[PDB]
Write a protein that binds this ligand. Structure first.
Ligand SMILES: [Zn+2]
Ligand SMILES: [Zn+2]
Ligand SMILES: [Zn+2]
Lengths: 123, 239
């Protein structure tokens, strides 16, 4: 794998406030050396040497964003974490991790944002 | 009353004449561009060493007593003078301001802001005296602010990012009163589930709301300075 292909698709109702109003959300994509530090870190820690590169994308409700960025050789894993208003911290449904093996060379992996969750759509 | 009338004259010569010259036609007393001097306001309303507190201690110790951070008339042995009710109301308002914003002997308070959310808003950027709070609809955290904060360019500003238009300015308010001017423009209501909380809402363009929760360390915090709007220091102590 040379480039990192990801597609982040949002449903109409994403990052819903208390009033049930859909809001835009920031999704962060991490190029990691290993998945231990990332996984062990909670929301607070993550959003204030495993980090090779970092990318932030803005996701609007009912919108889509395509990530095409150079995969740097050291990147054993890719971390996708959404800066949700009310994320489910017990379940940990606000983030996903993918190993290099999970990546296609020309084709993007589909990450679906719905409500307060990120789901990696099976290939 | 001859002693009382000479005291009314001492009050205007020692305090009111100077207060009026220094603060008339200036923000926050009037909604104008010209700013009242914060160091000079401190010289007048410092709780213990201020010009007003000194006149009260020196001339009214008998008939007027300090009760905590309040000024209370003596109900027994009035000499037998009648206070001008506007005078008691004025010194009580100023005591409340001093208690919240002039405790150190200079202007200075701390407060916290928690960003809210609204339809069509992607980002809010609130700046006061070089303290910045950027919010992008993530888990809301309380950010602590100081007013006035140390800077060569005091002021406050508020910008936002729309789902349709890009980054827009809500307002840009220069000067040492920047934050107070900004707060005055907000729609404010006392939030009874947060202490000491107020929900703040700035109405941006295209019906967009820029929402925050204000938590003060004491009383109304920076909102207390809005009590100076159209404030008149009475010309008499007694009727
Ligand atoms: Zn190819
Ligand atoms: Zn007395
Ligand atoms: Zn403080």
């Amino acid at each position: 794998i040379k480039t990192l292909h990801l597609d982040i698709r949002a449903r109409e109702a994403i990052n819903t406030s208390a009033a049930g109003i859909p809001l835009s959300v920031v999704v962060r994509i991490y190029q990691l050396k290993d998945n231990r530090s990332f996984d062990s870190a909670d929301y607070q820690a993550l959003f204030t040497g495993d980090i090779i590169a970092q990318k932030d994308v803005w996701l609007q409700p009912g919108g889509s964003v395509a990530v095409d960025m150079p995969l740097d050789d050291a990147a054993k894993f890719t971390g996708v974490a959404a800066m949700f208003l009310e994320p489910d911290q017990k379940k940990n449904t606000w983030r996903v991790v993918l190993g290099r093996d999970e990546l296609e060379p020309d084709t993007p992996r589909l990450i679906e944002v719905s409500g307060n969750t990120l789901t990696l759509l099976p290939v | 009353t001859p002693a009382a009338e000479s005291l009314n004259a001492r009050w205007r010569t020692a305090v009111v004449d100077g207060w009026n010259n220094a603060f008339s036609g200036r923000y926050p007393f009037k909604n104008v561009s010209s700013d009242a001097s914060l160091p000079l306001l401190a010289k007048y309303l410092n709780t213990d060493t201020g010009r007003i507190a000194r006149f009260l201690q020196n001339n009214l110790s008998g008939v007027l007593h300090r009760e905590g951070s309040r000024w209370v008339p003596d109900t027994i042995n009035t000499r037998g003078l009648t206070f001008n009710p506007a005078f008691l109301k004025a010194i009580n308002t100023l005591s409340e301001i001093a208690d919240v914003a002039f405790t150190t002997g200079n202007a200075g308070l701390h407060f916290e802001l928690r960003p809210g959310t609204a339809a069509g808003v992607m980002q809010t950027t609130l700046i006061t005296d070089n303290q910045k709070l950027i919010y992008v609809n993530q888990m809301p955290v309380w950010k602590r602010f100081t007013w006035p904060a140390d800077t060569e360019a005091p002021g406050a500003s508020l910008s936002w990012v729309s789902t349709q238009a890009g980054t827009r300015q809500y307002a840009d308010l220069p000067g040492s009163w920047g934050l107070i001017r900004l707060l005055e423009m907000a729609r404010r209501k006392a939030a009874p589930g947060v202490a000491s909380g107020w929900s703040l809402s700035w109405q941006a363009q295209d019906g967009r709301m820029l929402n925050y929760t204000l938590r003060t360390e004491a009383g109304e915090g920076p909102l207390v300075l809005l009590k100076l709007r159209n404030f008149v220091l009475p010309e008499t102590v007694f009727e």
